Structures are given as structure tokens and as C-alpha cells.
Amino acid sequence: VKEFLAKAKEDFLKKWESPAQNTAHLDQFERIKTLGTGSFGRVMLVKHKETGNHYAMKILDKQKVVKLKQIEHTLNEKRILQAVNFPFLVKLEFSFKDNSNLYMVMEYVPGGEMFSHLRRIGRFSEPHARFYAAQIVLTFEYLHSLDLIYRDLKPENLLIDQQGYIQVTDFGFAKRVKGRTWTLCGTPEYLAPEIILSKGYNKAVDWWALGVLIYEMAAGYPPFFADQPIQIYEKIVSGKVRFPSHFSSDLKDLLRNLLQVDLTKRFGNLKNGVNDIKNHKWFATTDWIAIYQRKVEAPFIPKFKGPGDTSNFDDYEEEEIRVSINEKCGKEFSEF
Amino acid sequence: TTYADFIASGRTGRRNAIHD
Numbered sequence: 411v412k413e414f415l416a417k418a419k420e421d422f423l424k425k426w427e428s429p430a431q432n433t434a435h436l437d438q439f440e441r442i443k444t445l446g447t448g449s450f451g452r453v454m455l456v457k458h459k460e461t462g463n464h465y466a467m468k469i470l471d472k473q474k475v476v477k478l479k480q481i482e483h484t485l486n487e488k489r490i491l492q493a494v495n496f497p498f499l500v501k502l503e504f505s506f507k508d509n510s511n512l513y514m515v516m517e518y519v520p521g522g523e524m525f526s527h528l529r530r531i532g533r534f535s536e537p538h539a540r541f542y543a544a545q546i547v548l549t550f551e552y553l554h555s556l557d558l559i560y561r562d563l564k565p566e567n568l569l570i571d572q573q574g575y576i577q578v579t580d581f582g583f584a585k586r587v588k589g590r591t592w593t594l595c596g597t598p599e600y601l602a603p604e605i606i607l608s609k610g611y612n613k614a615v616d617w618w619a620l621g622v623l624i625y626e627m628a629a630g631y632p633p634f635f636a637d638q639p640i641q642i643y644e645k646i647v648s649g650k651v652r653f654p655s656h657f658s659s660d661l662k663d664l665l666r667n668l669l670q671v672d673l674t675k676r677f678g679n680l681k682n683g684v685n686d687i688k689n690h691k692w693f694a695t696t697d698w699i700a701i702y703q704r705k706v707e708a709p710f711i712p713k714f715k716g717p718g719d720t721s722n723f724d725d726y727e728e729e730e731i732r733v734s735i736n737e738k739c740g741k742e743f744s745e746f
Numbered sequence: 747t748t749y750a751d752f753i754a755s756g757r758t759g760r761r762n763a764i765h766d
């Protein structure tokens with residue numbers, strides 16, 4: 411069952427070489443409510459006039475993207491999303507550009523971000539965190555085998571589907587990396603030390619981020635927090651972690667080998683690869699196969715009210731979509 | 747408590763990606 415990965419690499423290679431282009435237009439969708447806002451874009455709930463199906467539509471202002479030096483990151487995002495396929499990665503359904511914007515329309519995930527659930531209840535139990543963690547391990551195994559590094563693992567980007575399973579969204583920082591890359595990007599709390607020290611770094615930054623996610627899920631706070639990003643950066647590069655007293659000793663152990671500044675010593679990045687993680691004490695009762703197949707009982711199944719309910723998501727203030735009458739960033743996005 | 751410390755910090759909302 412590494413033949414699964416061989417076929418997965420061949421499909422990804424084929425979808426990589428010849429990418430779908432311009433497969434819907436704005437005026438086929440009714441825009442409803444913003445469901446989230448980012449540094450660069452915003453995502454709206456959306457109803458396709460012809461089938462009536464609901465989607466999540468990311469909108470990106472081409473000019474804002476050129477301003478914040480996010481072009482290749484934006485081309486990377488689309489190219490990768492259209493080229494991948496895995497249960498716990500959100501489907502891209504359509505993409506297109508008009509005079510002013512890039513648009514990526516994806517499956518609607520109605521349970522809201524892990525982030526909001528987690529903040530409301532403080533923390534998750536260890537069996538629950540474990541169940542969420544397993545999905546990410548499987549997903550990182552998959553993406554790394556395609557030489558894909560993700561780079562923005564965080565509660566905010568993990569949406570909970572109707573079966574209570576994760577769907578990972580926001581591939582803004584996902585890059586196809588042979589060996590090594592250098593862009594300072596990510597989210598401060600989740601950044602590996604390599605990135606902060608402007609070192610030049612590999613897929614092992616995602617395993618670092620995974621340790622943080624699991625800490626935060628089980629602690630209710632991140633292992634490195636302060637009021638400003640540079641100060642988080644100092645806490646991180648110290649490599650100085652304290653676990654709550656209730657973390658099980660298996661969890662302390664896993665987290666120490668994940669929250670490990672020394673690359674030669676970091677789980678994920680070793681002779682044994684991902685199996686150092688999969689075969690570790692704390693994941694011992696995890697059925698990896700039943701997880702991939704979604705046959706495990708989920709910690710919790712979100713409140714359903716209907717097609718087009720957004721009670722699981724916070725409210726944002728709106729901004730209307732202006733399309734311009736003259737094209738705005740031609741050759742920069744020729745390939746989108 | 748550390749959580750008490752976390753709750754009173756100024757980083758308890760959605761966190762944004764870093765720019766440059």
C-alpha cells in the first residue's frame with residue numbers, strides 16, 4: 411500500500427502539467443455572506459444559479475496580490491488545489507478570473523473552523539485531539555510524497571465537515587518544493603525555527619507545525635504565545651517548551667520529538683519518515699486505515715440547519731466586489 | 747494559570763498569515 415502513493419503521484423503529475431482554466435464566471439453565482447477574511451483574500455458562501463448547489467468562493471483582488479508580493483503563492487495555490495485529491499483536502503470545483511479578481515470556488519464545509527469550536531470549549535480531550543491529529547498526519551504523508559509542503563497548518567484553516575472530519579483549506583502557502591525553499595511565510599505561532607532564522611528549509615516545517623497544532627488542541631493555548639510576533643519568534647527559537655500537567659506522558663514525548671529545533675532529531679524528517687509518528691505510543695490505538703476511510707466515530711458532528719446555514723461561522727463585515735471595465739494584471743496571471 | 751495568561755493576551759482571535 412505504497413502503490414496507492416505511486417498512482418497518486420501519477421495523477422498529480424498529470425493534473426500538474428495541464429491545468430484546468432476558466433471553468434465558470436461570476437454571474438453564475440449568487441453571493442451571500444462572507445465566512446472568513448484573510449490577509450490577502452475573503453471567502454463567501456455562494457449559490458450556483460443553475461444547479462442551486464452551495465460553495466465557498468475565495469475572492470482575490472489581483473492588485474492587492476501584486477502589492478503584497480503574493481503572485482507565485484497565488485498561482486501555486488490554484489495549481490496545487492486543482493492537482494490534488496485526498497479525503498481531508500477540500501475540493502476545488504471551479505476557478506476563473508475577470509478584469510479584477512482571481513476566484514477559486516470550493517466545496518462548502520458547513521461545520522465552521524476548528525478554531526472557533528476550540529476557543530469556545532477551551533481545549534479538546536486527548537482522544538479527540540488524537541483523532542484530528544491523525545487526519546493531518548495522513549494528509550501530510552500524502553502531500554509530502556508529491557513534494558508538496560503546506561505551510562499554514564492552524565485551527566483557522568481546518569474546517570469540520572458534516573461527518574465531523576477535517577477538511578484542510580487555504581493553500582496560499584502551499585508550494586511544490588524539490589528539496590529546499592526560502593520564503594518567510596506562515597502564521598507566527600506555527601512557524602518552525604528554520605523559517606524565522608531565514609535558514610532555508612524543507613517539508614519538516616509542517617511536522618513542526620503539527621506539534622504546535624496538537625499542543626494547542628490539547629492545551630487550549632499554543633506552546634509559544636506573547637502579544638507580538640517577534641516575541642513569539644524568540645520563544646520559538648529558544649526551543650523551550652512547557653506542557654500542562656495533564657498532558658499524558660506519551661503526548662509529552664511525541665511533542666518533544668515534534669517540537670524539536672534540531673532537524674537531525676525531528677520526527678517526520680528521519681530514516682523512518684512518518685512512521686516515527688504513526689508508530690509512536692500516543693497514536694497506538696489509532697486505526698490509520700479506518701481514519702482514511704472515515705469509519706471512525708468523530709469527536710463531534712456539527713449542528714445542521716440547512717443548505718445555506720452559516721451559524722457555525724462568525725459574521726464579518728461585507729465589502730462589495732467591484733469588477734473594473736479594463737483588465738488589471740494580464741501577464742502576471744496569464745496561467746490562472 | 748498559563749491559560750489565564752493566554753485568555754488575557756492580545757492574540758486570542760483568528761491569527762493572520764505574515765507578510766514581509
Ligand SMILES: Cc1c[nH]c2ncnc(N3CC[C@@H](N)C3)c12
Nearest residue numbers: 445446453466516517518519579
Ligand atoms: C476556504 C474554504 C473552502 N471551503 C470553505 N467552507 C467554508 N469556509 C471556508 N473559509 C472560511 C474561513 C477560511 N479559512 C476559509 C472555506
